[PDB]
Amino acid sequence: PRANTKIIVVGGGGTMGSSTALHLLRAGYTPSNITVLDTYPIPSAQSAGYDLNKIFGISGANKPDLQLSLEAFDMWKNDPLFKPFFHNVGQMDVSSTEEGIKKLRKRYQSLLRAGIGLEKTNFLLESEDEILAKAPHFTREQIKGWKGLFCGDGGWLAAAKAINAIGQFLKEQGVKFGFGEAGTFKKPLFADADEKTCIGVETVDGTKYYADKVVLAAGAWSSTLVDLEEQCVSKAWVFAHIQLTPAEAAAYKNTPVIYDGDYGFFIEPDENGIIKVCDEFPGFTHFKMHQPYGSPVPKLISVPRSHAKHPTDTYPHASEVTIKKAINRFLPRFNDKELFNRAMCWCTDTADANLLVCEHPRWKGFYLATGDSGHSFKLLPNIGKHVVELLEGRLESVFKDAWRWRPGSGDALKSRRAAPAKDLADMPGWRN
Ligand SMILES: *Cc1cc2c(cc1C)nc1c(=O)[nH]c(=O)nc-1n2C[C@H](O)[C@H](O)[C@H](O)COP(=O)(O)OP(=O)(O)OC[C@H]1O[C@@H](n2cnc3c(N)ncnc32)[C@H](O)[C@@H]1O
Ligand SMILES: O=C(O)CSC[C@@]1(O)OC[C@@H](O)[C@@H](O)[C@@H]1O
């Protein structure tokens, strides 16, 4: 029974982590039986969720991605905890290349074959007038040849503030916490020498925590903490900020999120006039020799270079070009705006960009909740709901089979992106 079951959430200061803790409380677990451990206090300074904003949009990449995105959309609008941080201003995919414009038309078409009425909220913008109508800040000369796929369920998310909302709720309820060395996972604990029964974890300062179940929601660090047998390859993405005056930023107030697969995106300025800009690229790895728990020998493993641990870090020289390229493409009027708060942000890719949410195959009681594949912040309100379903063996098979333990199911280095990710060692500029 839930009221006497103890759960440990490793990486609980992050996205999937905090979500799991939230839905444990909502399910009826006793708050004092739930322990959140993270290297950083919630909201974790190093979770990929620690950002001014993230994009919300509907992805049809998989069978349950569609179901999950709509589920998340519902909560972002109607859940009292989350709905303050959803800005439902819409999201527009654009392209002016032949190859790219056809990608849009195929995406629109598969949304219709979902047969769940997505045509009511997704539209192909076939002319420049239709684009300028949704995003008046563009000039017509800037967008000639552009077509757009507009999603009315889209918009952006106050990412850090949202996780923080969960965290403060967890604390009011009485969830237990472990931060710093007292919260940094090192290894699982077992009752038996055969390590078939996990009964807790031990952190790096030596602290041992005991629970009935352990959830590993450590994002890009999961593949480094325990042997995931190359299922998850951690990669970095980049962003930068520019500052606008109240006059300049007024033209972008409540404007839709604009994305082009060949350039990146930007999100409307926040209350301080700050615009976040991203490029799009297959990501950056950081391979090192490491020996995650359960691996018999040290392997080559992409290990996150945490901006939180190294604040003087920025990103490779190459990324500076593509980010500015994106700025020129979308916001040419701000090309002389100096960039600041450059930083790398880490995700972990699976081969098929599906999550890795399953019980460990040998360590009974140890559960994996990661494989976010760099598309999963939008799932903050509802992913924890399905992790709990897994813990209780009530997980709908569509999710269960898609999220199953699956080593040898593809090359996660390339995943579903344009190319295998390049490594930080071959991309100078980020260390200072
Ligand atoms: C990097 C990035 C990601 C991203 C994005 C843009 C960038 C630049 N834009 C997104 C977007 O527009 N829309 C979207 O839906 N997602 C976007 N993302 C990715 C999204 O953030 C991630 O997919 C999502 O955050 C999933 O993360 P989850 O797996 O929870 O991972 P996390 O938030 O980083 O959490 C990791 C927590 O791990 C804790 N940790 C790490 N190591 C330990 C150890 N050793 N022990 C205990 N805890 C550990 C960290 O505290 C961290 O909080
Ligand atoms: O999937 C989305 O809703 C937008 S995520 C945008 C992005 O920058 O986020 C970081 C990585 O996921 C990249 O793959 C990706 O291009």
Author numbering: 3 to 434
Cite, word for word, the article reporting this structure:
To assess structural differences between AnFPOX-15 and AnFPOX-21, for which the largest improvement of F-6P oxidation activity was observed, the obtained X-ray crystal data were structurally analysed. AnFPOX-21/FSA was crystallised and the structure was determined via molecular replacement. The crystal belonged to P65, and it contained two enzymes arranged in an asymmetric unit. Although all amino acid residues from P3 to N434 were identified in one molecule, but S61, G62, and A63 in the other molecule were omitted from the final coordinate file because of the poor electron-density map. No significant structural difference was noted between AnFPOX-15 and AnFPOX-21 (rmsd = 0.436 Å and 0.441 Å for 431 and 427 Cα atoms, respectively), excluding for the structures in mutated residues, suggesting conservation of the elemental architecture of AnFPOX even after gaining significant F-6P oxidation activity by introducing seven mutations. With respect to AnFPOX-21 the B-factor values of the Cα atom of loop A (S61-N64) was significantly high even in coordinate-determined chain (S61, 94.22 Å3; G62, 84.36 Å3; A63, 94.43 Å3), suggesting structure flexibility of loop A because of the mutations. As S61, G62 and A63 have a smaller side-chain size in AnFPOX-21 than original AnFPOX-15, the mutations also alleviate structural interference for the entrance of bulky substrates. The surface model of the AnFPOX-21/FSA structure illustrated the opened active site gate even after FSA binding. In addition, the active site gate of AnFPOX-21 is apparently wider than that of AnFPOX-15, and the thioacetate moiety of FSA coordinated on AnFPOX-21 was observable from outside the molecule. This wide-opened gate of AnFPOX-21 is expected to be advantageous for F-6P accessibility and reactivity because the larger space should permit longer peptides to be accommodated.
